[PDB]
Amino acid sequence: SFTIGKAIWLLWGLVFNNSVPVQNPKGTTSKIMVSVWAFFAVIFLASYTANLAAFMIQEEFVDQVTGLSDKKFQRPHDYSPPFRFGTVPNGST
Amino acid sequence: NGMIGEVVYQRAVMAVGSLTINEERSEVVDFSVPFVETGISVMVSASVWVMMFVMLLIVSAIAVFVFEYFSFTIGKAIWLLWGLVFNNSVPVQNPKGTTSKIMVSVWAFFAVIFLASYTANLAAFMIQEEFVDQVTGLSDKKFQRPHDYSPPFRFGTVPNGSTERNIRNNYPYMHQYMTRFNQRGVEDALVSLKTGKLDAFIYDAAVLNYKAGRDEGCKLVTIGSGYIFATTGYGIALQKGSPWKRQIDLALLQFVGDGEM
Amino acid sequence: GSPRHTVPQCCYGFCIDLLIKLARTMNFTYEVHLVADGKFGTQERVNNS
Amino acid sequence: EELETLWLTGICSSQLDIDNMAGVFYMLAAAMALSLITFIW
Amino acid sequence: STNEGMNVKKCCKGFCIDILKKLSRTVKFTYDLYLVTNGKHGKKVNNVW
Amino acid sequence: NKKEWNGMMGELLSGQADMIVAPLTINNERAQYIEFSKPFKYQGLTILVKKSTLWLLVGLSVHVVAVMLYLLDRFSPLTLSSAMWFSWGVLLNSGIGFSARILGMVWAGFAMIIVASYTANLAAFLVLDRPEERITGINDPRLRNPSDKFIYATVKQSSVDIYFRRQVELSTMYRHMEKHNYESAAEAIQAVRDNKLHAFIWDSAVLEFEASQKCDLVTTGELFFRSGFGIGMRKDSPWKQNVSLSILKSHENGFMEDLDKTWVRYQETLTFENMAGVFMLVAGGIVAGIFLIFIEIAYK
Amino acid sequence: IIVASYTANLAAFLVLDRPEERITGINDPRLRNPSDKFIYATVKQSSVDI
Ligand SMILES: *[C@@H]1O[C@H](CO)[C@@H](O)[C@H](O)[C@H]1NC(C)=O
Ligand SMILES: *[C@@H]1O[C@H](CO)[C@@H](O)[C@H](O)[C@H]1NC(C)=O
Ligand SMILES: *[C@@H]1O[C@H](CO)[C@@H](O)[C@H](O)[C@H]1NC(C)=O
Ligand SMILES: *[C@@H]1O[C@H](CO)[C@@H](O)[C@H](O)[C@H]1NC(C)=O
Ligand SMILES: *[C@@H]1O[C@H](CO)[C@@H](O)[C@H](O)[C@H]1NC(C)=O
C-alpha cells in the first residue's frame, strides 16, 4: 500500500487504460466509483472519436491574399518569396 | 360515357386530358402516340475468422516453442491472446518469454489496426441505408388470398376506371375480393392510407408518383417503377379517321426531341 | 399610430455619406427629409377616376 | 437568369495534419522540459 | 503586303449573342452583326479612340 | 446531291422489306416518312461505365522516449530491455507485468492521440476514396465542355446520333463524338470492356440487360429521352390497325410481362480488401521475427 | 463489440444526419404548396412584391 500520491497517476491510467501497471485497491469504494469514472472515460473516448469523425465534414482551405489591400501587391520585394501578377495588354483593367 | 362518349358521338374533336389507352377505346377512337410512360402501380406506406484462428494457433505454437526453450501459458496463451485481440484489460498471464513479449507486441499492433479496421467496417455498414418493401407488384401472393396471411389487407381502386377494366379482364376473382373495398375518391384513399383505413391502392402509376413526389412526410412508398405492370402511355385521342393525327404525332415527337417535354 | 407628429432628427449612414460625397464634389446645397410612410412605392388604383 | 444558367455553369495518405500533431509534439517538448525541471531538483 | 482581306462569314454564339437575339425579337429591329478588325475594346490613344 | 436512307429503312422503302420488327428508336425524322405502331417497350437513354513517414517518425519518437526513460533509470533520484519493452507495451496497450510516471503518462496520451488520429484517417478515407470520374450526369460541364480523357460516343449513324445532332447546344458533343463512333454495339461493349470508353450513350434496358453480364458493367441512374421501341411499318397499309391492336392486347395481359420474364426481368469496405495483404504482411513479419528469435537463441 | 457499435452509431447520430434548416430558395417544394408552417413574406408594397 503506497498509493497516497500515486493515486493520481493510477486514476489517470484507469481513465486511459494503456496497459499501465496499477496497484489494485482492496476497497469496494474506489472500485465502484472508478468503474463509473472509467465508463465516463470510455464514452469520452467515443465522443472524441466522434469529434474527429466530424472533423472531416468540412472542405475549405482559406485564401492567401485577401485582394488589392495586401502590401504584397503594393510591394513585392518587401516579401521574401517572389510572386508574379499579370493582366491583358491595352485593356480597360 | 364521359370523354369517350363525347369523342365517339362527335360532340367534340379531341381529348387532351389524362386518359389511358386500351383495346376497346382504340377500337372506338383513334389515338395519337403516347408522350409519357404511364403504367399502373400500387400505393402502400467467414474466412477472416478462419485465418485469425489459424494465426492464433500459430502464435500459441510459438508460445509452446518458448516453453520448450525457456510456465503455465500452454492453454492460457489462447486466453491472453484473444483477450488482447480486444484489449479488455483482463488479468490473464505475465509473459516472461522474450520471444513471447516480441510476439505479443506485434500481435497487439495487429489487434489495434484490426479493431480500427472494424470501426471502419462499422461506418461502412452505417453509411448504406436500404428501403425494404412488402408487396412486389400485382404478382404478390398476398393478392392470391388475403386470408393466406392473417390480417385481411385492403387493396382498392377508383370506381368506373380503366384500371377496373384491366383487373376484371385479368382476374374477376380479384374484382370479387375488391368488391368489399370499393372506395370513391383519390384523396379519400390518400387519407385512408395516411390514417390506416387502407393497406394497398391500385391506380395509375404517374398520378401516384405525382402525389408521393409532393407529399409532406414521404410515408407512402411506390413499388418500383412500373416493372410488372400495364406499361402503357397517355396519348391524345382523336375522332375516327381524323386528319389531325399526323401533325399531332409529329409535333409530340418534336416536343420530345427538343427536350421541351 | 402617429397621425401628426413630425420632428427634425439626425440622419447618417451609407447613402447619407454618398450624398455628402456628391455635395462635396458637385456644387449644390441640399435638404434631406424623410418620406411620410414606410414604403418604397407601388402603383395601385386610387379611389377616384 | 435562364441564360446565366445556360452559359455560365460550373461545379462547386497517412500524413494528414502535421500541424495539430506537431502542437502535441510541442506539448511533448514542454513535458520533457518539465522532466528536466524535476531532474535538476 | 496589303491590308485588304476577306469577310469570311462565321457563326456567333454565347451569352451576349442570346441577349442580342432577344433584344431583336423584343424591340423588333434588324441587324448585321460583324466582328472587330482593330483588336481589343478601346483606349483613348492621345485623344484618339 | 440527293437525300438517301440506308439501313432497315433502306430495305423497307425499296420494297425489299415489309415490316421492321426491331428495337426501333422512335424519333421525329422517321415519323415524317413512314408510320409506326404503339411501342411495345418504353425505354430511355443511359451511360454504361466501368468500375508512411510518420510511422518511422513515431518509431524514432518511442526510441527517444526509451532513451530518456532509461536515463531516468540510470540517474535515479535485464532492466534495460524491461524498461524499453515497458515503453513499447505502453505504446501497444498490451503485455506488461517519479517523473518516469509523468513521461509515460505523456507518451500514453500521445499514443492515444495517434490511434484517434488513425481513426480519423480511416473515417476520412472511407468517404473521400470515392471516384468523381463516375460522373453520372449529362449536365456535367465535363460533358458540355469535353475533356480528351473522357471518351464518350455511340453507334455511328444511330437514332441517338441524330437526336444528338438535333440538340440545342450539343454540336460541341456532336463534333466530339465523331472521334469514336463505332459501327456495331458489340464492338462498343468490347471497347468499354477494354476500359477505352469512359462513357457510352445507349438505350436503357439494353444496357440494363448488359449490367448483369459482368459486375463492373455499371449503368448510370439518369433517365433521359424516354422513347419507345415499337414496330416499324409502311405508309397507309392494312397491317397497321390490327397489328397495333394485337400489341396492345399483349400489353393488357401479362404476355408482355412473360416476354419480360424471358429476357428483360431475367438477370445473369468488407473484411477482405482492407485485411488480406495486411494479414499476409503480418505473417511474413512473424516469419522474419522467428528468424530473429533463432538469432537470439544462438546469441546466448 | 457493443461499445464499438455504440461509438459507431453515436458518431452516426452526431455527425452524418442533419435536418435542412435552410430553404434553398426557389427549390423548396414546401413553398410551392405552402401552409401555416413556412411563413414567408416580404415588405408590404415593395419592389420585391412587384
Ligand atoms: C498594345 O498597343 C501597342 C501600341 O503600339 C501595340 O504595339 C501592341 O501590339 C498592343 N498589344 C496588343 C494588342 O496585344
Ligand atoms: C359508376 O357507374 C355506375 C353505373 O352507372 C353509376 O351509377 C355511378 O354513379 C358511377 N360513379 C361512381 C360509383 O362514383
Ligand atoms: C457654387 O456656384 C456659385 C455660383 O453658381 C459660386 O458662387 C460658388 O463659389 C460655388 N461653390 C463651390 C463650392 O464651387
Ligand atoms: C377608397 O378605397 C378603399 C379601398 O377599397 C376603401 O376602403 C375606401 O372606403 C374608399 N374611400 C371612400 C371614400 O369610399
Ligand atoms: C382487322 O380486324 C377486323 C376485326 O377484327 C376485321 O374485320 C378486318 O378484316 C381486319 N383487317 C385485316 C387487314 O386483317
Three-state SS annotation for G2-27: HHHHHHHHHHHHHHHCCCCCCCCHHH
- Only one residue has cell 406506406, namely B45
Chain A residues within 8 A of G10 when measuring between CB atoms: 46-47, 50
Backbone Cα Rg of chain B = 34
Residue having the nearest C-alpha atom to atom 11 of ligand 1: A89
Question: Which of B221, B210, B255 is CA-nearest to residue B43?
Answer: B221
In whole angstroms, give the CA distance from residue C33 to residue C12.
Answer: 12
Residue B110 vs residues B105, B113, B116, F270, F280: alpha-carbon distances, Å:
9, 5, 10, 17, 12
Q: Do chains D and B touch (3 or more CB pairs under 8 A)?
A: no
In whole angstroms, give the CA distance from residue F195 to residue F296.
Answer: 52
Three-state SS annotation for D1-39: CHHHHHHCCCCCCCCCCHHHHHHHHHHHHHHHHHHHHHH
Question: Which of B234, B160, B162, B149 is CA-nearest to residue B200?
Answer: B149
Question: Which of F77, G44, F74, F129 is CA-nearest to residue B124?
Answer: F129
Residues 6+ away with beta carbon under 8 Å from C36: none
Which of D3, D4, D9 is the best residue to mutate to test the E interface, defined by the most E CB atoms within 10 Å of its own CB? D3
Helix (H) or strand (E) holding B40: strand B40-43
In whole angstroms, give the CA distance from residue E46 to residue F107.
Answer: 74
Residues 6+ away with beta carbon under 8 Å from B209: B41, B222
State the greatest distance between any 2 C-alpha atoms of chain A, in Å, as a whole number: 89
- Report which ligand 2 atom has the smallest distance to the Cα of B160: 1
Nearest ligand to the CA of B186 is 2
In whole angstroms, give the CA distance from residue B18 to residue B153.
Answer: 30
Residues 6+ away with beta carbon under 8 Å from B85: B107, B111, B114
Minimal-distance CA residue of chain D relative to F105 = D31
Cross-strand partners of B42:
B202
- Cα(A90) to ligand 1 centroid in Å equals 6
Strands F199-203 and F152-153: parallel
Question: Which residue in G8, G30, G35 is closest to B126 by CB distance?
Answer: G8
- Report which ligand 5 atom has the smallest distance to the Cα of F239: 13
Say yes or no for a CB contact (<8 Å) between B120 and F163: no
DSSP letter string, chain F: ------HHHHHHHTSS-S-EEEEEE--HHHHTTS-----SEEEEEEEEE---HHHHHHHHHHHHHHHHHHHHHHS---HHHHHHHHHHHHHHT-----HHHHHHHHHHHHHHHHHHHHHHHHHHHTTS-S-SS----TT-HHHHTT-SSS-EE-BTT-HHHHHHHHSSSTHHHHTTGGGS-BS-HHHHHHHHHTT--SEEEEEHHHHHHHHTTSTT-EE-S--EEEEEEEEE--SS-TTSHHHHHHHHHHHHSTHHHHHIIIIIS-----TTTTTHHHHHHHHHHHHHHHHHHHHHHHH-
Residue A76 corresponds to which cell in the numbers above?
513585392
Residue B235 corresponds to which cell in the numbers above?
396519348
Nearest ligand to the CA of A87 is 1
Chain G residues within 8 A of A46 when measuring between CB atoms: 3, 6-7, 10-11
- The contacts found for F274-283 with CB under 8 angstroms, 24 or more apart, are F274/B117, F274/B120, F274/B121, F275/B48, F275/B114, F275/B117, F278/B110, F278/B113, F278/B117, F279/B51, F279/B55, F282/B55, F282/B106, F282/B110, F283/B55
Minimal-distance CA residue of chain G relative to C40 = G46
How determined? cryo-EM
- Cα(A91) to ligand 1 centroid in Å equals 10
Say yes or no for a CB contact (<8 Å) between D6 and E19: no
Last residue before each break in chain B (C–N > 2.5 Å): 45, 70
Resolution value in angstroms? 5.1
Say yes or no for a CB contact (<8 Å) between A49 and G7: yes
In whole angstroms, give the CA distance from residue F199 to residue F140.
Answer: 13
State the greatest distance between any 2 C-alpha atoms of chain E, in Å, as a whole number: 45
In whole angstroms, give the CA distance from residue G32 to residue G40.
Answer: 11
- Contact between B17 and B3 (Cβ < 8 Å): yes
- Contact between B13 and B169 (Cβ < 8 Å): no
Say yes or no for a CB contact (<8 Å) between A92 and E39: no
Helix (H) or strand (E) holding B121: helix B98-127
Size of interface B-G (CB pairs under 8 A): 21
In eight-state DSSP terms, residue B144 is T
In whole angstroms, give the CA distance from residue B196 to residue B209.
Answer: 20
Say yes or no for a CB contact (<8 Å) between G49 and C41: no
Question: Which residue in A17, A49, A53 is closest to B89 by CB distance?
Answer: A17
Minimal-distance CA residue of chain D relative to E15 = D7
- Cα(F247) to ligand 5 centroid in Å equals 14
In whole angstroms, give the CA distance from residue B177 to residue B179.
Answer: 6
- Contact between A79 and A72 (Cβ < 8 Å): yes
- The contacts found for F129-132 with CB under 8 angstroms, 24 or more apart, are none
Rounded to the nearest 5°, which phi and psi values hold at D3?
-70, -35
Using an 8 Å CB-CB cutoff, list residues of chain A that contact chain B.
17, 19, 49, 53
Cβ A89 under 6 angstroms from ligand 1: yes
Residues 6+ away with beta carbon under 8 Å from A42: G3
Q: Which residues 1-41 of D have a C-beta within 8 angstroms of E?
A: 3-4, 6-8
Question: Which of F114, F112, F63, F60 is CA-nearest to residue F84?
Answer: F63
- Cα(C35) to ligand 3 centroid in Å equals 29
Say yes or no for a CB contact (<8 Å) between E41 and A92: yes
